[PDB]
Structures are given as structure tokens and as C-alpha cells.
Amino acid sequence: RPCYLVLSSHDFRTPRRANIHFITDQLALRGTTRFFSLRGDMRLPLDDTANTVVSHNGVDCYLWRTTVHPFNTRRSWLRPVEDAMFRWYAAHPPKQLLDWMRESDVIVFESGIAVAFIELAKRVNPAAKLVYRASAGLSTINVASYIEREFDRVAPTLDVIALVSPAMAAEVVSRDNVFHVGHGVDHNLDQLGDPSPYAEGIHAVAVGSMLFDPEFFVVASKAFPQVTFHVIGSGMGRHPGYGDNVIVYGEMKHAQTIGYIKHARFGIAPYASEQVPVYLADSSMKLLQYDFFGLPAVCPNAVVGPYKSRFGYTPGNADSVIAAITQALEAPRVRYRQCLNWSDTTDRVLDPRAYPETRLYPHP
Structure with a gap:
């Protein structure tokens, strides 16, 4: 029974599931599933649970709360401060993240801030399968320049880049590990x-x-x-x-x-x-x-x-x-x-190569 860790800006507990929640529901059916929430916030009702593990519908949830988070200032001249903030964020994962990473067979990074933790994941657990779920294009989210570069940097080393849409592929700087797996129902x-x-x-x-x-x-x-x-x-x-x-x-x-x-x-x-x-x-x-x-x-x-x-x-x-x-x-x-x-979807998110129709580039 494979152990999963999801990294996302969502929290698993937020009512009104997004795509990642439905996938995570499927993960929870397959193995120990952790879901590690990053970055007026929808998650404010959860503040009193911050920095602790809470169990929710079979998933271990953690809302990481730092004092400040890195974000896109949207000011070109503030870009060295941003990079500094993102590097800092990336360099101070809480023990709980590190532990969950170590424990995982599969780490799923949702598009966005999760990108900042891909390199970390590889250092903590090189054996873990690294799945990036592109729920959105980085440019659409309008992530800071740091997140784009870091993604371009690490993208080829991911085991899976599971794009919700083939239309996402143009802005993804990798090929052999880029697959199309749309949302399930x-x-x-x-x-x-x-x-x-x-x-x-x-x-x-x-x-x-x-x-x-x-x-x-x-x-x-x-x-x-x-x-x-x-x-x-x-x-x-x-x-x-x-x-x-x-x-x-x-x-x-x-x-x-x-x-x-x-x-x-x-x-x-x-x-x-x-x-x-x-x-x-x-x-x-x-x-x-x-x-x-x-x-x-x-x-x-x-x-x-x-x-x-x-x-x-x-x-x-x-x-x-x-x-x-x-x-x-x-x-x-x-x-x-x-x-x-969602189950058939989660199967391809996790093992797109076992479903060769998902390939976005020439097959092995």
C-alpha cells in the first residue's frame, strides 16, 4: 500500500472540493494519504489547527502556517526580494513536511507554490515518484518569476507531469515526462x-x-x-x-x-x-x-x-x-x-506511462 503526499495551496478540509481533492479521495482509498497545505484566505476557519496534523476523511491534513509566505509582488524591481522570499520558504520546510516526504511512495505537487518543494522532495526521498498535477498553467496563476524558473529547472526530473489539458504543454519545458490526464468525474x-x-x-x-x-x-x-x-x-x-x-x-x-x-x-x-x-x-x-x-x-x-x-x-x-x-x-x-x-483518472495521474494514450510527445 503506497503512501501519498499531496502538496498544494488548497487544504483538503476546505468545503467545495477542487480537482486535487477528488484525486486525493482516490489516493486515500489506495494508501496512507497526506495532504500538506502551502502558502483573506479560504483556509482561515482552519487557523486554530495550523501546524498540526488533523485527520479528515481518511487523509492526514496539515495546514502549514508561517508568518509570511512568498508571493508575486508583480513589481519587476522587487524580484530579488521575491526570489529571496521563495528561497527562504523553500529552505525552511517544517519537520512534518520532511517526515511526510520521507514516508511517501508518491508525492503529488499541484501546480503553483508546490513547485518550490520539488527539489526538496528529491533530496528527502529520491525513490519517491514525483507527480506534478498541472491543474493550472503557472502563468495563469501568475506565480512569481521564481516559481516559473524553478519549474523549468526541475520539470525534466519529475517522474510525471500530468497536464489537465494538452494546451498546457507549450509552457512546460520538458517532454519525455509530460502526459495528458484531464479531470475525472x-x-x-x-x-x-x-x-x-x-x-x-x-x-x-x-x-x-x-x-x-x-x-x-x-x-x-x-x-x-x-x-x-x-x-x-x-x-x-x-x-x-x-x-x-x-x-x-x-x-x-x-x-x-x-x-x-x-x-x-x-x-x-x-x-x-x-x-x-x-x-x-x-x-x-x-x-x-x-x-x-x-x-x-x-x-x-x-x-x-x-x-x-x-x-x-x-x-x-x-x-x-x-x-x-x-x-x-x-x-x-x-x-x-x-x-x-476519478479512480481511472487517478490511475493515469500516477502511472501515465501504463496508459500510453496520455503521452504528449513521441512514445518509448
Whole structure:
């Protein structure tokens, strides 16, 4: 039974799992799983647990809290101070990190600050398989110059670079160890799918707070008084612009969202900006959920990507909003996207070479 360590800026305990949490759920099923949280913070409710191991759903969690963390100042002239701060951070891992590294068979570094600990991992445990999970491009996160360089530096020495999107590969300075392993879905999405939460009529759903654009709903609700818009986990309340045909929900647990997704007529990824990476079309978790069911989606043009059943609009552009919805209403529901479950996904994250279709560069 292999022992796993996940390094990330998430904490495993934060409600509303991201991709890394779902992977970590799978790791916990396979072996001793540790999850070692790095870097107003979402993790503040956990502050009284800082610097101690807490067990959560079978995972050993640690929220490392230093006085200051290294970060991108976004000031070219402050760059030697940054590098100094990152080097310092990197040079003072807590004993607990070091111990967990020693104990691991596999260390997973999520894209971001975790990069600063790859060299450390190799010194502490050269036998550990080093898996980098590129949940995001470094440039999108806008990491400090130090993290980019360090990543370019260490990237070839990683055992696995598991990119959520092949579109991530251009900015990854390595080849032989770069694989494509997109997000999984819950193995029982279709079982969670229902009973239906909706009565008669036309229902559209949006889930998640990422770049949440209320203006989408302001326009859409007015233009489609016959569509009921279910806005879940927007991170926001009832925008005063919403028509009465918008229902605003608090944060819902993933499982409870599923019925609202399966039984909608179309879904919506209402990102307020198109200043988004090209890979977001692949890496969007909500879009994936919609895609699993063949639910037509309305989303900005920037995240349609290479996908059928996605109707682009320009945020801020009422007409394009209307036009995309008009098409999403008439789109047939077809499961175009192949969606591996989280377990099958975690299998390729960990051993992509055993699944040679994941290779992004010429095979051995």
C-alpha cells in the first residue's frame, strides 16, 4: 500500500472540493494519504489547527502556517526580494513536511507554490515518484518569476507531469515526462443525477463561483422569462438585476448539484472575463459536469474550445448572450465527451506511462 503526499495551496478540509481533492479521495482509498497545505484566505476557519496534523476523511491534513509566505509582488524591481522570499520558504520546510516526504511512495505537487518543494522532495526521498498535477498553467496563476524558473529547472526530473489539458504543454519545458490526464468525474454521476429537483418548464443551471458574472443572468432572465435560471454556488446573493425567474441557491454539496445539472435543459459557465487560458475549455470542472450529461452549455467564446454543444457569447454583450442561449435551447443532448471517473483518472495521474494514450510527445 503506497503512501501519498499531496502538496498544494488548497487544504483538503476546505468545503467545495477542487480537482486535487477528488484525486486525493482516490489516493486515500489506495494508501496512507497526506495532504500538506502551502502558502483573506479560504483556509482561515482552519487557523486554530495550523501546524498540526488533523485527520479528515481518511487523509492526514496539515495546514502549514508561517508568518509570511512568498508571493508575486508583480513589481519587476522587487524580484530579488521575491526570489529571496521563495528561497527562504523553500529552505525552511517544517519537520512534518520532511517526515511526510520521507514516508511517501508518491508525492503529488499541484501546480503553483508546490513547485518550490520539488527539489526538496528529491533530496528527502529520491525513490519517491514525483507527480506534478498541472491543474493550472503557472502563468495563469501568475506565480512569481521564481516559481516559473524553478519549474523549468526541475520539470525534466519529475517522474510525471500530468497536464489537465494538452494546451498546457507549450509552457512546460520538458517532454519525455509530460502526459495528458484531464479531470475525472464521479463514478456515480448518473446515480446522483436524480430524482429531479425541477417541476415542469425550462430550467437552466449554473454552478460555481469562478469569475461569476451576474450580468449574464440579469440579461438572460429578462430575455427568457420562460426559462428558470438556477444559480448555484455563485459566491454571490440575489443580484438586484435578476428577474423573478432566477433562483439563487447557497453553496450546494457536489452530490446535490448533480440533479440540477442532469435535469436542466442547458447549463451555463458565466465567466465574466475572456482573459482566460486556452486550456480552461478542458480544465473547467463545471463544463465537464455538463459535458458528462451532454447538457448543452452557454459559456464565453474563450472557453467553448474544441467542444460541441457549447454556445459562445461575449461577456457584457447582451445580444451574444441571447443568441447563445437561443441555440443552447435547441441543441440536442449528446454525450460527446469521454469522461473517465476519478479512480481511472487517478490511475493515469500516477502511472501515465501504463496508459500510453496520455503521452504528449513521441512514445518509448
